[PDB]
């Protein structure tokens, strides 16, 4: 019939889950007065720690999360946050101007501005979620 909009929402949900896990590191790092890494000096996103450990049966390999990550133009068998943010294809559009390591250097203190920048691409996802969920709630 017309299910494709739900599948777009499964994608938006997985997209937001990945951002939410990243923000869950960010808020802890800030609260611990630590910096954060987006590059090959940081973590890789194509890892079962996004939910748990090992292959918890094929459900994780089958997930819209794993599918999207393994689909990316920037995916290589591996993918950093920098490669994910500057990655494609995805519903949010791409983010430019990325660095490498964001230091908790006191004054001008920039780690919150990276969090805010990820929040900036999260706003369109809330907007798209709001409209698409509204249209779905008119289904």
């Amino acid at each position, epitope marked *: 019939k017309r299910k494709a909009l739900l599948d777009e929402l499964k994608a938006l949900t997985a997209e937001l889950k990945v951002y939410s896990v990243i923000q869950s590191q960010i808020n802890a790092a800030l609260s611990a007065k630590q910096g954060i890494r987006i590059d090959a000096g940081g973590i890789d996103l194509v890892d079962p720690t996004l939910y748990g450990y090992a292959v918890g049966d094929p459900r994780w390999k089958d997930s819209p999360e794993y599918a999207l990550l393994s689909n990316l133009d920037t995916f290589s068998g591996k993918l950093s946050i920098k490669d994910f943010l500057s990655g494609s294809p995805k519903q949010s559009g791409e983010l430019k*101007g990325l660095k490498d390591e964001y230091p908790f250097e006191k004054d001008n203190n920039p780690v919150g501005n990276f969090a805010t920048t990820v929040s900036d691409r999260s706003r369109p996802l809330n907007d798209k979620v709001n409209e698409k969920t509204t249209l779905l709630n008119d289904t």
Partner: antibody
Framework: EVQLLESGGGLVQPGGSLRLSCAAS????????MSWVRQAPGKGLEWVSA????????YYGDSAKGRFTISRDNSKNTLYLEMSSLRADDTAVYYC????????????????????WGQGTRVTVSS | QSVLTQPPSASGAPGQRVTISCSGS????????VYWYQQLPGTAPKVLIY???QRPSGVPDRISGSKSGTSASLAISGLRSEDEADYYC???????????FGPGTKVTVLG
């Protein structure tokens, strides 16, 4: 001397469009986020767009139906706004500013208040 | 909640001291350390102060920034022609409160 410098401004025509732009000098502006603001005769200042153009829908305010938005290039140390489908009222003066001063979080939303400003230019519906 | 006001309305001869001050509340003021705006006639608005009381790479520390509980404040010494201005104690937004950028305040060096 350390300063910003603008380009684009002067005169415009109804239903058309035109660009304003801002460039940094004397500092390595490099990656710092940027926000846009308006002035008019006999008043201080107001918002035009926050951070990036994300606080900058093609419909003004939180809504008012006017087609204005932005682009960004701190690698060029310079950034841009476009103006389209004009009212008479879009006739005004405009400025841009960078983030800087922030520590210990303290504000716990956005930032402790923003920190440096451009020189700006007139815009007029020349019909 | 609507808590800032912009009242001080001062003027004084060249070189004098002046005290300049604005209201507020502890949801807000405790979260900041001082920054305000100055505007000469025929100009775009400009920087005043940072790092609790420090003035720009171009002007001396003639100014002290300050605050206390439900209020925010400033004072100046050795006042000059470039201090002929409208002054704004603002926070770069309109938001929900009655004052968040506000009217400014005319201040004059009485030459």
């Amino acid at each position: 001397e350390v300063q910003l410098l603008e380009s684009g401004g002067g005169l415009v025509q109804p239903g058309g469009s035109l660009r304003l732009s801002c460039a940094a000098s004397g500092f390595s502006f490099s990656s710092y986020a940027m926000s846009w603001v308006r002035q008019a005769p006999g008043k201080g200042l107001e918002w035009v767009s926050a951070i990036s153009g994300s606080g900058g829908i093609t419909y003004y305010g939180d809504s008012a139906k006017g087609r204005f938005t932005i682009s960004r290039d701190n690698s060029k140390n310079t950034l841009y706004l476009e103006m389209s489908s004009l009212r008479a009222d879009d006739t005004a003066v405009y400025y841009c500013a960078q983030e800087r001063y922030c520590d210990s979080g303290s504000c716990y939303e956005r930032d402790p208040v923003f920190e440096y400003w451009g020189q700006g230019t007139r815009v007029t519906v020349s019909s | 909640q609507s808590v800032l006001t912009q009242p001080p309305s001062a003027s004084g001869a060249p070189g004098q001291r002046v005290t300049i001050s604005c209201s507020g509340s502890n949801s807000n003021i405790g979260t900041y350390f001082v920054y305000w705006y100055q505007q000469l006639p025929g100009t775009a608005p400009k920087v005043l102060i940072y790092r609790n009381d420090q003035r720009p790479s171009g002007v001396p520390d003639r100014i002290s920034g300050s605050k206390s509980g439900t209020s925010a404040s400033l004072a100046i010494s050795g006042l000059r022609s470039e201090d002929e201005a409208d002054y704004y104690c603002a926070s770069w937004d309109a938001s929900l409160r009655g004052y968040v950028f506000g009217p400014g305040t005319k201040v004059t060096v009485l030459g």
